[PDB]
Isoform 2 of Ectonucleotide pyrophosphatase/phosphodiesterase family member 2
Amino acid sequence: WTATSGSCKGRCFELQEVGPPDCRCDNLCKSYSSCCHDFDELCLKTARGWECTKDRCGEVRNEENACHCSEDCLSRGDCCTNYQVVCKGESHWVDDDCEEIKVPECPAGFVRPPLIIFSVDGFRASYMKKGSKVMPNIEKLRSCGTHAPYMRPVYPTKTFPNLYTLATGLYPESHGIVGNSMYDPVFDASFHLRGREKFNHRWWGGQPLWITATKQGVRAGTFFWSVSIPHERRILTILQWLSLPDNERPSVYAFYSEQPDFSGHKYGPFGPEMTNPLREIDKTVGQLMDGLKQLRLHRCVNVIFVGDHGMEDVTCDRTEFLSNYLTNVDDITLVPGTLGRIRAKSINNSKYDPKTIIAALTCKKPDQHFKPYMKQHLPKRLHYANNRRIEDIHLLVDRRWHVARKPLDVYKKCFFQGDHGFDNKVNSMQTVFVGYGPTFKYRTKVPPFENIELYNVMCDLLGLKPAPNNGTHGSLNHLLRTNTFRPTMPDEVSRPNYPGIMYLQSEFDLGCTCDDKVENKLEELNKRLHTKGSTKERHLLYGRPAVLYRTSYDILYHTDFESGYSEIFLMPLWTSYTISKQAEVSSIPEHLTNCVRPDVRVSPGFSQNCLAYKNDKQMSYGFLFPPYLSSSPEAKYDAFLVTNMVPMYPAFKRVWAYFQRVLVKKYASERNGVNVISGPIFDYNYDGLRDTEDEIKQYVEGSSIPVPTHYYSIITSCLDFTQPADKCDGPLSVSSFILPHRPDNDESCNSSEDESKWVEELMKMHTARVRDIEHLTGLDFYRKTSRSYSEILTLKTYLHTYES
Ligand SMILES: *[C@@H]1O[C@H](CO)[C@@H](O[C@@H]2O[C@H](CO)[C@@H](O[C@@H]3O[C@H](CO[C@H]4O[C@H](CO)[C@@H](O)[C@H](O[C@H]5O[C@H](CO)[C@@H](O)[C@H](O)[C@@H]5O[C@H]5O[C@H](CO)[C@@H](O)[C@H](O)[C@@H]5O)[C@@H]4O)[C@@H](O)[C@H](O[C@H]4O[C@H](CO)[C@@H](O)[C@H](O)[C@@H]4O[C@H]4O[C@H](CO)[C@@H](O)[C@H](O)[C@@H]4O)[C@@H]3O)[C@H](O)[C@H]2NC(C)=O)[C@H](O)[C@H]1NC(C)=O
Ligand SMILES: Cc1nnn(Cc2cc(C(F)(F)F)ccc2CCC(=O)N2CCC(CSc3ccc(S(N)(=O)=O)cc3F)CC2)n1
Ligand SMILES: [Ca+2]
Ligand SMILES: [Cl-]
Ligand SMILES: [K+]
Ligand code: NA
Ligand SMILES: [Zn+2]
């Protein structure tokens, strides 16, 4: 019930929301069917439209007009945005040269530069170049301010997950808005774009910027706008709020446009019908800037122009149907489109089997345009698993395609030519970022970055302490002139032991053998030196990683590599080695094929054993430092230490051997040396965070050797590739991966072929940020470089994406 017979007189676009049954006058009242009877009349005036003309200049104030051209309008805060242009011979903001804004130039009574977020739905990154002729206001912001060539959205590249990620700094799995449609089995409730359940606050986790602001005494405009409020009125409302007295006036605001998404869906991303929506967004930006200039705020306000996601060409004829694969197609519920999510139709069906559905969808047709995954097998970079609303079965749909249950779903629901929602590495899904204002840099290009980082920066812009989030605070300091947040490196929690030779060979009963019985004082002192770390500067280029949790581990030095060996997990946490451009690849000698050697620095009881691998018929073993890249025949024996061994499924060894034998050398040739850090990851509860021992769900049969869910590598070199990796004086270049440790290669449809036709494609799919590896391992990398910490943070957030 709403008692709609109250009034909005003096309350239009009120900031405090009032409780039912009292009638409302705020931004969102329309969307709740709760506005007072007179809201249209009083708050949505349209008479005479939105622009002053010469003949209105100095008019007698008429309160019926949408906006005003009378002499009192500036003091009332309600001039048409062009008032001073038409009636006082001022220039439009876009016609003025840009001038660096070195300090905020604010009216008296402003305590901080306000922040205005101009958000645009479906604004694909390439519009900045391809639409530039029709967007002069946006182009001036972009060239005069700070801009990235694009900004990476989160997966799925849908509207609600991305807007709320922008507002919270959180991954959808953590904020809870995991799609445009959702089922929550604990609630037993359904969330959709149409209708009322979505207004219940229980869906919306984390803490959005407007709540952060309000809890810390910074006032906020309401961010949301009901669709029938025209854009011109949204701008006027923002500008009116900015004329409020100091104690009432917000410091943070948001504008939102449904365009160009709305048109992009109908006409496709570059349909000729798209020039007009882009023109109109630009005009809106011009209105805001001219309005701010009127208020003498155009060199005071920080403005962010930001998109939620891009838009791709998709048509009804590019739909895959699950009825062409499954027999039982009515025993499932599919959330469909540019992604697929599958669950049982009825929780009273014990004949539901996910395993059989996965097999029925896996590599069934030769050009298949989707790939099924159990959610825990999705690429870790998507961070799309740790939520009860994300269904166990997921379909990653190829760009330009849809998935649907049956053809009848597609014609009893071609209309559309555009859609989005695909993998967030896809070029067509990328979106835009521009920052303009006193606190942003002047005419500065910055590298592409992920939208999860922006919440921290918006908090910095407003002097707020961010709530706990998935940004890496400091990684975007290079966007800012001032207000930088000065992060410190985390403190190492566990210090390593440095074991010397403490055990005789015969103390070991590991059931391992090696043909290594081959006896010189010149080379005897030398090998001692290598074991004490004489080559460590070569192989550990950026310091040892720091261990940020409580544990027991040893540093082990060797000629060709250094490792941090966990007494708890019985294997290295990390293994570091450097491969120069000139290094040679060799084979494992025939005599050493099954060689595993006890490590006399590490007790039998904190060692793996070969017998467990023999008895475990599913599980084999591999090595972290590759025997193929040994620097000499003698150094090669170090690679067969039991302390360099890790459990590997035979199917995974095909991948790992190819990486170690072929790809490491290839990268060293291309990048002029590389430093590699590799290791295991345990994430059995798929939360993106390092498992404790008591969370491990699988061990090598008969043992306490835990089985990794993934293996990582971090591959670093000099950004200036004319310098070798091991003598780089400037910034670094990194690529990383987190490969799933799987017993089959069902993910790779071409895996019966040679590794050269499929392994690298797999690795590219599982590309990662260093930061992703940090969360999964409790390690902190790049602790000792010549680089500034903010720059290192930026490097740790880089994702190598493999798009053109
Ligand atoms: C990205 O950034 C985010 C934010 O920093 C990271 O997520 C955080 O990670 C922490 C570790 O997983 C986690 O900390 C736990 O929080 C518990 C309290 O949680 C509530 O209160 C906070 C505070 O305001 C709130 O934010 C939470 O919000 C979640 O849940 C609500 C619904 O209830 C949702 O609206 C919201 O979207 C959010 O859901 C997401 O997170 C939850 C986990 O909380 C997931 O389950 C969801 O799927 C979704 O992803 C909560 O309202 C706290 O109780 C925990 O403490 C337990 O563990 C410690 C270990 O030391 C133990 O000693 C304690 O005894 C305790 O255990 C007891 O309970 C167990 C569970 O029932 C039980 O089994 C035991 O036997 C014990 O009885 C813990 O501190 C933090 O909440 C989330 N925050 C958010 C916002 O998601 C995220 O990790 C980052 N991602 C990456 C990749 O880095
Ligand atoms: C989704 C979403 N997430 N965050 N925003 C705000 C936002 C963030 C940013 C940002 F700065 F973050 F970039 C910029 C701009 C916005 C405004 C977006 C907006 O007016 N749109 C149109 C209105 C539509 C109503 S739907 C709705 C409302 C309230 C609630 S409630 N009761 O508050 O839980 C629930 C709802 F489902 C949502 C999307 N929208
Ligand atoms: Ca985990
Ligand atoms: Cl969805
Ligand atoms: K075995
Ligand atoms: Na396969
Ligand atoms: Zn859309």
Notes: The chain has 22 helices and 28 strands. The longest helix spans residues 650-671.
